[PDB]
Design a protein around this ligand. Structure first.
Ligand SMILES: Cc1cc(S(=O)(=O)N2CCC[C@H]2C(=O)O)c(N)cc1Cl
Length: 557
């Protein structure tokens, strides 16, 4: 069936949308090529609609079924709990979109009687009705990128489809525990979201080593959400249903599946019917877990069809990477063809054809790749990095405009060991925080789809716990990484690293003069900017981070 059916009504914005990079007095210090940065708007919704609207056909064989039976077997060992209303409420983001029934995220977090009462009615309705399609709002996402000449210029906005706040709280009650625990049990070490960036690197490295003659490839399916069929979504539900669940949760999960996850009508911000959906909704609690399960199932079955030996996979939603025993350059390239053919049969055709790789560092998954640097003792060490183009473009935007999500902070946290994050991101933003005296001001960022509220003064401890003390001492990066960064800076008109090192000394001195937690930031985050280093000793914090992905899941911590 068709992924979507449209009425003709436009995807409308809910507020004024900016497309050009906002500019203030701080802009030029970071980036000069302003015309290269842009944000997507509803204005390009039509283009996206065309890319994501197509017919899906599925041909399921024994390998698919065999894999599924195995997945259900592990799933049946899972026991999930129903979340109370108060519990679900506290998982709601302070700035989550308000309900159309008279209450917002604040009312939900405070457990207002109005909010709580409506939630109870929605829940009761889920239990009493398993057939009425639930409404959803389709919106065009506003995201910042750098123009990509060798791609088509600018990317059209991505679409987000989500149900009302009341329904969103109900999803949490019925499936938060499920989507938080099931994946790791079913997929084991292949479930990507259970790792911090350092553990991810470690798992890729040990997996690569575990093979006599390693070979790996990333597999990117075209518009994964749109390739997800009704069958896929019902298979996802049969898996959830394998868990030891409370009778009330089974009914709720069956209801949400039939009424929301399988598909439903699309309404714009103006309240007009835009059409109907028959594929994965990007804005529901099961988006990450569902995509991950479906991707793991199709790829695992595809590996058997292609006869790839000793296949170890790493899955993060729709992002797939596979490492296995090479049977030879020629044999490997042939297998990939079969793999891709099977994936296609399963309704997961490729965007960019997959290609075998024999150098772990040349594989990009989740927009990242492993690279090498050296620690204090001079030891060779691996860490996760990525092309800094998008992170820098977003930093530029956030430099002049406050946003709901601070990507620079999320990036410093996730890529703390990187050359670009340490020299540019940290230097630039701490300078800004210093000038405004907002070092102690908590900021919202996003990690694995979940929203976290974090004080930059806490960066030192956060980084140490996540990446180890070594993150404050890496040096001698690879020529490849150095050149990618230096090249990206010229592309965007960003001052060269030598300028950043000079600025860091100042920011460092400034942080030190303020003593306390600020000084710790200066001492640890910027020890790389001094000629003669300090010792750097552990720093004298709850982390329920890195357990599951919640992209588009409306989750807060
Ligand atoms: C290193 C890394 C970082 C992120 S993240 O920084 O948590 N991510 C990318 C930017 C937005 C954010 C998210 O997924 O919420 C993700 N998803 C995957 C990997 Cl392998």
């Amino acid at each position: 069936s068709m992924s979507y059916t449209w009425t003709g009504a436009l995807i409308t914005p809910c507020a004024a949308e900016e497309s050009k990079l906002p500019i203030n007095a701080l802009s030029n210090s970071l980036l000069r090529h302003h015309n290269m940065v842009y944000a997507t708007t509803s204005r390009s919704a039509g283009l996206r609609q065309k890319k994501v609207t197509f017919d899906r056909l599925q041909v399921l064989d024994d390998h698919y079924r065999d894999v599924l039976k195995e997945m259900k077997a592990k799933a049946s060992t899972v026991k999930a709990k129903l979340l109370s209303v108060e519990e679900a409420c506290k998982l709601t983001p302070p700035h989550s979109a308000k309900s159309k029934f008279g209450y917002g995220a604040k009312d939900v977090r405070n457990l207002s009687s109005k909010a709580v009462n409506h939630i109870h009615s929605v829940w009761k309705d889920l239990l009493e009705d398993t057939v009425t399609p639930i409404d959803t709002t389709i919106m065009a996402k506003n995201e910042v990128f750098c123009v990509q000449p060798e791609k088509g210029g600018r990317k059209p906005a991505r679409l987000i489809v989500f149900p009302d706040l009341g329904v969103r709280v109900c999803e949490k009650m019925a499936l938060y525990d499920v989507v938080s625990t099931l994946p790791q049990v079913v997929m084991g070490s292949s479930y990507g979201f259970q790792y911090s960036p350092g553990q991810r690197v470690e798992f890729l490295v040990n997996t690569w080593k575990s093979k006599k003659n390693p070979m790996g490839f990333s597999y990117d399916t075209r518009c994964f959400d749109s390739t997800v069929t009704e069958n896929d979504i019902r298979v996802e539900e049969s898996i959830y249903q394998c868990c030891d669940l409370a009778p009330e949760a089974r009914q709720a999960i069956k209801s949400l599946t039939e009424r929301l996850y399988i598909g439903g009508p699309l309404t714009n911000s103006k309240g007009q019917n835009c059409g109907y959906r028959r594929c994965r909704a990007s804005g529901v609690l099961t988006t990450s877990c569902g995509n991950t399960l479906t991707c793991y199932l199709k790829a695992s079955a595809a590996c058997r069809a292609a006869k790839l030996q000793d296949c170890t996979m790493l899955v993060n939603g729709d992002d797939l990477v596979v490492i296995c025993e090479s049977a030879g350059t020629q044999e490997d390239a042939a297998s990939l063809r079969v793999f891709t053919e099977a994936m296609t049969r399963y309704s997961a055709p490729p965007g960019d054809p997959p290609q075998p790789e024999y150098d772990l560092e040349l594989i990009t998954s989740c927009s990242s790749n492993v690279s090498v640097a050296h620690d204090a003792s001079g030891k060779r060490v691996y860490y996760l990095t990525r092309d800094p183009t998008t992170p820098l473009a977003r930093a530029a935007w956030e430099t002049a405009r406050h946003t709901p999500v601070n990507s620079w902070l999320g990036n410093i946290i996730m890529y703390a060991p990187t050359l670009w994050a340490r020299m540019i991101l940290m230097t630039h933003f701490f300078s800004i925080l210093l000038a405004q005296e907002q070092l102690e001001k908590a900021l919202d960022c996003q990690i694995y789809g979940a929203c976290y509220s974090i004080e930059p003064l806490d960066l030192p401890q956060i980084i140490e716990r996540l990446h180890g003390l070594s993150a404050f001492s890496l040096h001698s990066y690879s020529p490849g990484e150095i050149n990618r960064v230096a090249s990206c800076l010229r592309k965007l008109g960003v001052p060269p690293l030598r300028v950043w090192r000079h600025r860091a000394r100042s920011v460092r001195a400034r942080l030190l003069s303020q003593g306390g937690r600020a000084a710790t930031c200066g001492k640890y985050l910027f020890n790389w900017a001094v000629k003669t280093k300090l010792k750097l000793t552990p720093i004298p914090d709850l982390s329920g981070w890195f357990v599951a992905g919640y992209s588009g899941g409306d989750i807060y911590h």
